PDB file of C-alpha atoms in Angstrom:
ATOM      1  CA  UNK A   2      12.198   7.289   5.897  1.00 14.92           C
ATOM      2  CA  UNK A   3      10.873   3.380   5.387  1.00 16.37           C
ATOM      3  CA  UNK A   4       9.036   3.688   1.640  1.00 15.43           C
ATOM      4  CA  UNK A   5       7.839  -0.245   2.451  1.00 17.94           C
ATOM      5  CA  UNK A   6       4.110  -0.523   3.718  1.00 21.95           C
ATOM      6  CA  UNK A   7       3.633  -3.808   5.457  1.00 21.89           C
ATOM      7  CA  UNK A   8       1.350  -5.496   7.877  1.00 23.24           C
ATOM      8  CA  UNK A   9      -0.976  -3.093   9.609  1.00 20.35           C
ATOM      9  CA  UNK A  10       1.245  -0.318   8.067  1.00 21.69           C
ATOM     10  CA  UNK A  11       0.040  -1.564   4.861  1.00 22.31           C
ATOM     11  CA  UNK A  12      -3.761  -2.339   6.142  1.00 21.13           C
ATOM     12  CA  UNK A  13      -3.533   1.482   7.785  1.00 22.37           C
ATOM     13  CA  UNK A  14      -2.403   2.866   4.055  1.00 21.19           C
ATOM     14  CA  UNK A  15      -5.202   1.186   2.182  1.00 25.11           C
ATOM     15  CA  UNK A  16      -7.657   2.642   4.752  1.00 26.35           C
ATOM     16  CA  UNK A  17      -6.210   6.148   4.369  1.00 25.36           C
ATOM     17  CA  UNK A  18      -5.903   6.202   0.720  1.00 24.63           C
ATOM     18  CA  UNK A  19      -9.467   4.084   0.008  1.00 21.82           C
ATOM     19  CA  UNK A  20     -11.407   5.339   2.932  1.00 21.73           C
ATOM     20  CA  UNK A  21     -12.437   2.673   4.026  1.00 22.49           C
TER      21      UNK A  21
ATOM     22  CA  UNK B   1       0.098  -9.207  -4.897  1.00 20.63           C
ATOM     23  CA  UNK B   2      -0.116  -6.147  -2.943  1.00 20.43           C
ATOM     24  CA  UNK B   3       2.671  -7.263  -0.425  1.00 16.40           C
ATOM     25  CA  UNK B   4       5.088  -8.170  -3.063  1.00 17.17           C
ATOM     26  CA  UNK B   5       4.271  -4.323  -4.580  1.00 12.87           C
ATOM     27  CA  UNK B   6       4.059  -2.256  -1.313  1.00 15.85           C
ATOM     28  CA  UNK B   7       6.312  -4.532   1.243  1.00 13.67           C
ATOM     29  CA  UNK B   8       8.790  -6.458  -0.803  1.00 14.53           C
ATOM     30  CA  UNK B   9       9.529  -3.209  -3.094  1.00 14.56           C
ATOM     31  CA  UNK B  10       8.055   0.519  -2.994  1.00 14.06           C
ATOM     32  CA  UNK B  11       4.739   1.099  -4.469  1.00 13.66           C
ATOM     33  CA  UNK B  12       2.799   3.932  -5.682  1.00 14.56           C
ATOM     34  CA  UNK B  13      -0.597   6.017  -4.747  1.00 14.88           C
ATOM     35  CA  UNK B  14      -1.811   4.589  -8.072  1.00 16.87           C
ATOM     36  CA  UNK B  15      -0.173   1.136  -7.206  1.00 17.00           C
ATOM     37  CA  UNK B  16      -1.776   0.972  -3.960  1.00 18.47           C
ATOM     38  CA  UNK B  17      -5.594   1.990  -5.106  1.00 18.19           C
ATOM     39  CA  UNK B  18      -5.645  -0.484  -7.349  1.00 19.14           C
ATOM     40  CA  UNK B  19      -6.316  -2.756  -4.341  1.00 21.16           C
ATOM     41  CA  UNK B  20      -9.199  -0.496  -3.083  1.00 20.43           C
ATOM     42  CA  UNK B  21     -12.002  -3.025  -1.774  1.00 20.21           C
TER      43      UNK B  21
END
């Protein structure tokens, strides 16, 4: 399991964790 | 910045909200 959040990864985290 | 925290290394939940908006 990748731990690293990048690109739209990282875009698709912040809109989980943020909702929105 | 948040790609340095949460690409380059491994970041947190707490990290990671920090960038909310």
């Amino acid at each position: 399991v990748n731990q690293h959040l990048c690109g739209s990864h990282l875009v698709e985290a912040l809109y989980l964790v943020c909702g929105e | 910045g948040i790609v340095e925290q949460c690409c380059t290394s491994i970041c947190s939940l707490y990290q990671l909200e920090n960038y909310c908006n």
